Amino acid sequence: NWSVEDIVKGINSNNLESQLQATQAARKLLSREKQPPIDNIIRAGLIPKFVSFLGKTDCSPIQFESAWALTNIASGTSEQTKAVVDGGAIPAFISLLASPHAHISEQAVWALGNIAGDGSAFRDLVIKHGAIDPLLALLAVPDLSTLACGYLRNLTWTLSNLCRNKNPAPPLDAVEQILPTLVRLLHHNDPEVLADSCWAISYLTDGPNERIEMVVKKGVVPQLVKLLGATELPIVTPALRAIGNIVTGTDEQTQKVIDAGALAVFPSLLTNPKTNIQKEATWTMSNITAGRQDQIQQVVNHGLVPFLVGVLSKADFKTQKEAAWAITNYTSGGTVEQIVYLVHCGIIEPLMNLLSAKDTKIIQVILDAISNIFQAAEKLGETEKLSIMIEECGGLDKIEALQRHENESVYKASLNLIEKYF
Amino acid sequence: MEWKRVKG
């Protein structure tokens, strides 16, 4: 590898070919795994020279080498991405999207994804400079399979970064412009394209119900449910996040997920050996059980209540916390018969066992659930049958103890339970 | 999903 001193000497020469060789040397230096000297390159003042090389239509190799050098600077810290932006790189890269050389266009796609991926402001600045139209034009072919696989993956990734980040979320008009191309990529037979399109949809559904509706209205929920069943974990993870985001919305949006067949996948998701999949599947279930009684009934009919008992009984603690939420939502919204059924599937003992957790929130959530179940037992006149039952698995003792507990609503709710029913 | 990517 050249020294930065020698790179500067070549780039400052009055010889395009010497400048090209020094830019290639910079690209290779910036491409090394252990500790590329990005800040030294920036301090040498080389970004403005790279940016001017982007505009050299008559010398496509130096366009490519400087684009690659800038991509690797823009892939670093936010301060390093800012330095690239501050050199004027955004409009220069957008101009290269139309290049007849596919490797240059791809480099510009990559660079704009790094810049937009830095955060909301640079994302929106890339959009204001007009990146979306020429990016989408690169996919305006009748069959995506004629594109080079790596080229297509790069485009999908950059589009997903334009859908990414919040406060603010991407402009509504930009989302509507990008969404039809995302729908297409969601049906493309490449695992990495599918994964990144799912990530893009996961970003677009992470927000208010109006944002969810823009996605749901494009009809993608059945495809997301299909991708929930993929064997590739990199596909299932964002597809599940997208589905979980959608069921934070209205009852009608939640119903489209159920109508699409999503509940049939949850026996596997709720026992998945990847901890994060189990956690997000249980979180998703907790928002479905927060729904209407007929939606709780579909959870019942699909045999998913035993699986909720399972995750409550044994899972990573954060997953068990989501299961507690699922149970409190179920018993808050459910009919008496639905709550009786929950008790018949064995919810009481694992609920009580979690009262030993040193976590105030889950104790509150569980106490709420227990009160909800007693209210159903009152309507049936069977409060004592439930009391004896809490007693027999050791639940009374753990409720007694929380009378002596720091947090106020805990001992409040704990006290009331023992008074009224014990 | 990776937020930024180095081309090696």
Swiss-Prot record, chain A:
This is Importin subunit alpha-1. Functions in nuclear protein import as an adapter protein for nuclear receptor KPNB1. Binds specifically and directly to substrates containing either a simple or bipartite NLS motif. Docking of the importin/substrate complex to the nuclear pore complex (NPC) is mediated by KPNB1 through binding to nucleoporin FxFG repeats and the complex is subsequently translocated through the pore by an energy requiring, Ran-dependent mechanism. The lineage of its organism: Eukaryota, Metazoa, Chordata, Craniata, Vertebrata. Consists of an N-terminal hydrophilic region, a hydrophobic central region composed of 10 repeats, and a short hydrophilic C-terminus. The N-terminal hydrophilic region contains the importin beta binding domain (IBB domain), which is sufficient for binding importin beta and essential for nuclear protein import. The IBB domain is thought to act as an intrasteric autoregulatory sequence by interacting with the internal autoinhibitory NLS. Binding of KPNB1 probably overlaps the internal NLS and contributes to a high affinity for cytoplasmic NLS-containing cargo substrates. After dissociation of the importin/substrate complex in the nucleus the internal autohibitory NLS contributes to a low affinity for nuclear NLS-containing proteins. It comes from Mus musculus (Mouse). It is found in: Cytoplasm; Nucleus. Its main location: cytoplasm. The gene is Kpna2. Keywords: Acetylation, Cytoplasm, Nucleus, Phosphoprotein, Protein transport, Repeat, Transport, Ubl conjugation. Ubiquitinated. Deubiquitinated by USP22; leading to stabilization and increased activity. Slightly detected in brain but not in cerebellum and skeletal muscle, highly expressed in testis and spleen. The keyword Ribonucleoprotein does not apply. One of its GO terms (cellular component) is cytoplasmic stress granule. Residues 241-329 are annotated as: NLS binding site (minor).
